Amino acid sequence: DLEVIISLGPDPTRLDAKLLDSYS
Amino acid sequence: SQKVFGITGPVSTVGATAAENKLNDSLIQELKKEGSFETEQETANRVQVLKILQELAQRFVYEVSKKKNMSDGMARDAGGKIFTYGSYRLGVHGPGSDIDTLVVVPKHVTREDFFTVFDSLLRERKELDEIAPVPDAFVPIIKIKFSGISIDLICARLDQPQVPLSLTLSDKNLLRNLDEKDLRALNGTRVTDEILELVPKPNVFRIALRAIKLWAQRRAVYANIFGFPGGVAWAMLVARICQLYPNACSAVILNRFFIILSEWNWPQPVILKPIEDGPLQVRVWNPKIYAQDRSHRMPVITPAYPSMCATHNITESTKKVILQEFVRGVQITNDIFSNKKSWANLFEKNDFFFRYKFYLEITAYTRGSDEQHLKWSGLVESKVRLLVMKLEVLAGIKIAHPFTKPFESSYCCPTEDDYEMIQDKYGSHKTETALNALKLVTDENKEEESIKDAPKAYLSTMYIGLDFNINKKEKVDIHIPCTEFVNLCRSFNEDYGDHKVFNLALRFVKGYDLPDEVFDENEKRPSKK
């Protein structure tokens, strides 16, 4: 089970563009 | 004269042996089985269509010349002429293939004339079943279907009073005083004409190219937008090998093609003749003068003045794939030549969705017209490459492999809530079954008084396969490149920020959890290792 971060959202394996500014 | 043997002369001038020809015969036969060739009949139809278009091009020009108050004689003499280019012109087109076509007109015929006069002449024809004019395109074009055959028509306006039937486009001075759109419009024809004149035996070349196109498609190394060689590039690569082996048969050509392109000293260019100068302020490929040119990784240069690189888009990662595929070509063709493998083997479908443990989905979503989706996803697609590039430079990323085709689907999307859900559940096999609840719009099911009516949501998905470098212990962080990519999908002179309509999502996914859509009828999805 390898961990890979693509976003800073609640699910690090999912990046939804409209939520981008609400992550960081 | 010796132009036909390329810039270093032949490697060998020895002709084909019987054993070689047999293996050539089985190649053409495999090509036939695979449906490379259309029948003589559908070729006959193609010829007839161009005839009618040639008639119409002459008429078009005639009518405009009458409007400028020339005599009958001068209007006729003003001429007007149809040329083909790309696959068809080369003799490598297939059953469904479009004909890329160019209408050449004298000085006094504008493109405003082309989009009015020529357009209305096309509409007059019974043979015309669909027409899509797109004036404001990068190359202005008219897409038509004529007698079931798809034609793409572009227009070039020369600095000349007349375009006679006898006109060939090979002289540099045909390019004088042209604006960039016209300059561009001439290039496709001049390039493919020149490839034809730079090849020792055209029929041998045609068969070799048919083989390469099939292979490239099946091995998923055919897609310019995603950083692989397109049609013209492959054609030129095949042409180069034909020059080194003027008397070889196609089977042999393929063999030597995989060996030489796999041992090529890349980034040294493949060129079909010495690159030339000319009188114009137009950029020629020149790594010495241009930093951009210098950064091309597998340069394949068109021969017609302005020489340009037809593989600008290749990235470190795509060059890796192309090279693997050549190395595979080398082993399979030698095996065919050893009576140990068949041609069917060389054309075996790629196994992209089985070869990596992890994938990065990139999804364009649209809730609106399919015209809106085309635009939005077209934008997203064109950047995938740029994502490949940011990822591939990273220390932990061994490769970022873009697949060469988007995965399209659409659902009936009555509400905003259905749209949240599509976005939520799509892309993982764990949650994928949730959207059977929403009617899946089918290529075979489009009853217009039911399906083709409802508000619809469209998805387009690209897949990047990933291999990591990992005897090291850490979380692999690729959010900056993903975020940078998202910001590249930037609304240029149109807006995509209304998320009630457009969306963009990326998802990292393990092989076994890939969406079904990704596997054929005969493929069984992989499972948890």
Side-chain angles (χ1 to χ4, degrees), chain B residues 121-125 127-316:
Chain B
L121 288 169
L122 288 166
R123 289 177 192 271
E124 277 169 344
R125 301 292 300 205
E127 305 97 333
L128 187 282
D129 31 308
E130 233 218 67
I131 179 155
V134 43
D136 49 81
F138 170 72
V139 194
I141 192 171
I142 297 178
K143 286 157 202 264
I144 59 161
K145 208 168 103 158
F146 210 76
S147 291
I149 304 156
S150 295
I151 315 290
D152 293 345
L153 283 143
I154 64 178
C155 198
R157 171 199 190 184
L158 307 174
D159 187 38
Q160 275 177 23
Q162 312 195 320
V163 176
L165 259 171
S166 68
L167 174 75
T168 49
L169 297 178
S170 86
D171 175 16
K172 282 191 200 166
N173 287 126
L174 299 173
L175 309 176
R176 71 166 184 214
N177 302 292
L178 301 195
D179 47 72
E180 46 201 63
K181 268 159 195 161
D182 283 302
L183 221 308
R184 230 181 281 118
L186 289 176
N187 193 224
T189 300
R190 292 161 42 71
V191 167
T192 57
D193 279 350
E194 251 176 83
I195 295 171
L196 281 177
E197 306 169 321
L198 284 157
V199 97
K201 300 213 259 101
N203 69 288
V204 167
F205 159 81
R206 282 183 249 261
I207 261 45
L209 217 201
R210 285 188 178 269
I212 292 313
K213 291 177 93 221
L214 185 62
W215 170 84
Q217 226 113 24
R218 294 257 267 250
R219 304 308 294 173
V221 292
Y222 190 110
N224 196 75
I225 195 186
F226 300 109
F228 290 97
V232 183
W234 285 122
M236 285 184 281
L237 288 165
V238 173
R240 178 79 267 243
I241 312 299
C242 291
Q243 293 169 334
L244 297 172
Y245 300 90
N247 292 133
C249 68
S250 304
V252 158
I253 291 289
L254 298 181
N255 176 223
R256 314 292 153 129
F257 162 111
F258 289 123
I259 298 175
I260 283 163
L261 281 340
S262 70
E263 294 165 352
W264 200 267
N265 199 19
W266 300 112
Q268 279 302 108
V270 0
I271 67 175
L272 270 13
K273 56 161 207 185
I275 299 189
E276 56 206 355
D277 271 328
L280 303 152
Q281 309 308 69
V282 290
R283 183 176 165 335
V284 172
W285 192 78
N286 184 318
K288 191 200 307 284
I289 291 169
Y290 301 106
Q292 181 189 339
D293 289 342
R294 217 148 58 229
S295 88
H296 298 156
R297 306 164 150 110
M298 300 182 84
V300 184
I301 313 302
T302 56
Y305 182 66
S307 264
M308 155 258 203
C309 180
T311 54
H312 174 82
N313 289 350
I314 295 182
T315 80
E316 304 297 352

Side-chain angles (χ1 to χ4, degrees), chain A residues 2 4-8 13-18 20, chain B residues 358 423-424 475-476 478-479 486 503-508:
Chain A
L2 175 83
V4 170
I5 291 148
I6 71 146
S7 85
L8 300 179
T13 67
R14 294 194 80 178
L15 189 180
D16 181 10
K18 87 240 203 209
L20 202 45
Chain B
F358 322 107
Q423 281 162 257
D424 189 28
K475 281 174 145 292
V476 166
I478 64 150
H479 85 277
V486 165
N503 280 279
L504 175 59
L506 289 82
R507 185 200 261 271
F508 174 89

Side-chain angles (χ1 to χ4, degrees), chain B residues 208-442 445-446 448-451 453-469:
Chain B
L209 217 201
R210 285 188 178 269
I212 292 313
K213 291 177 93 221
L214 185 62
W215 170 84
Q217 226 113 24
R218 294 257 267 250
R219 304 308 294 173
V221 292
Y222 190 110
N224 196 75
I225 195 186
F226 300 109
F228 290 97
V232 183
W234 285 122
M236 285 184 281
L237 288 165
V238 173
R240 178 79 267 243
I241 312 299
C242 291
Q243 293 169 334
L244 297 172
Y245 300 90
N247 292 133
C249 68
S250 304
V252 158
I253 291 289
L254 298 181
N255 176 223
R256 314 292 153 129
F257 162 111
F258 289 123
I259 298 175
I260 283 163
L261 281 340
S262 70
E263 294 165 352
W264 200 267
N265 199 19
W266 300 112
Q268 279 302 108
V270 0
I271 67 175
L272 270 13
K273 56 161 207 185
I275 299 189
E276 56 206 355
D277 271 328
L280 303 152
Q281 309 308 69
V282 290
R283 183 176 165 335
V284 172
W285 192 78
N286 184 318
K288 191 200 307 284
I289 291 169
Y290 301 106
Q292 181 189 339
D293 289 342
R294 217 148 58 229
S295 88
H296 298 156
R297 306 164 150 110
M298 300 182 84
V300 184
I301 313 302
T302 56
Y305 182 66
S307 264
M308 155 258 203
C309 180
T311 54
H312 174 82
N313 289 350
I314 295 182
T315 80
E316 304 297 352
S317 283
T318 57
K319 164 167 140 64
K320 270 196 255 197
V321 174
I322 294 169
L323 286 185
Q324 274 148 37
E325 289 306 322
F326 292 143
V327 169
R328 188 187 165 270
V330 172
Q331 277 144 40
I332 292 173
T333 55
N334 287 171
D335 278 355
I336 292 154
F337 269 84
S338 263
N339 312 348
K340 296 162 54 66
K341 271 157 137 86
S342 74
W343 293 101
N345 298 142
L346 185 61
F347 305 128
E348 230 148 56
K349 180 198 147 60
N350 74 78
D351 73 338
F352 175 90
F353 299 98
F354 295 91
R355 69 182 301 184
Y356 305 101
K357 274 104 55 145
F358 322 107
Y359 296 82
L360 182 63
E361 297 166 8
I362 307 151
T363 297
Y365 304 90
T366 299
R367 174 147 138 82
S369 82
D370 84 315
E371 172 142 13
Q372 276 171 312
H373 178 74
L374 238 175
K375 264 163 137 46
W376 175 228
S377 61
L379 207 224
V380 174
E381 257 155 62
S382 63
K383 310 295 173 190
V384 173
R385 213 174 70 60
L386 275 15
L387 183 47
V388 170
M389 277 164 74
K390 297 155 167 295
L391 255 31
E392 74 182 7
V393 178
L394 262 30
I397 297 273
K398 199 205 277 264
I399 200 156
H401 189 157
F403 196 52
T404 48
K405 190 206 73 171
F407 280 86
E408 319 283 2
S409 48
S410 58
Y411 305 88
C412 280
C413 204
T415 69
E416 287 197 66
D417 272 17
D418 305 349
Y419 190 37
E420 280 163 53
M421 177 257 109
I422 295 175
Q423 281 162 257
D424 189 28
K425 299 320 195 90
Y426 173 88
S428 167
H429 192 248
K430 252 190 163 290
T431 57
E432 198 174 32
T433 59
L435 50 267
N436 303 337
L438 293 164
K439 192 95 283 304
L440 215 193
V441 175
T442 317
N445 311 324
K446 263 215 289 184
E448 286 155 357
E449 282 197 15
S450 191
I451 293 162
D453 187 346
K456 287 179 278 292
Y458 299 88
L459 328 209
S460 290
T461 291
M462 292 92 232
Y463 293 92
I464 296 163
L466 303 153
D467 211 12
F468 298 97
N469 298 120

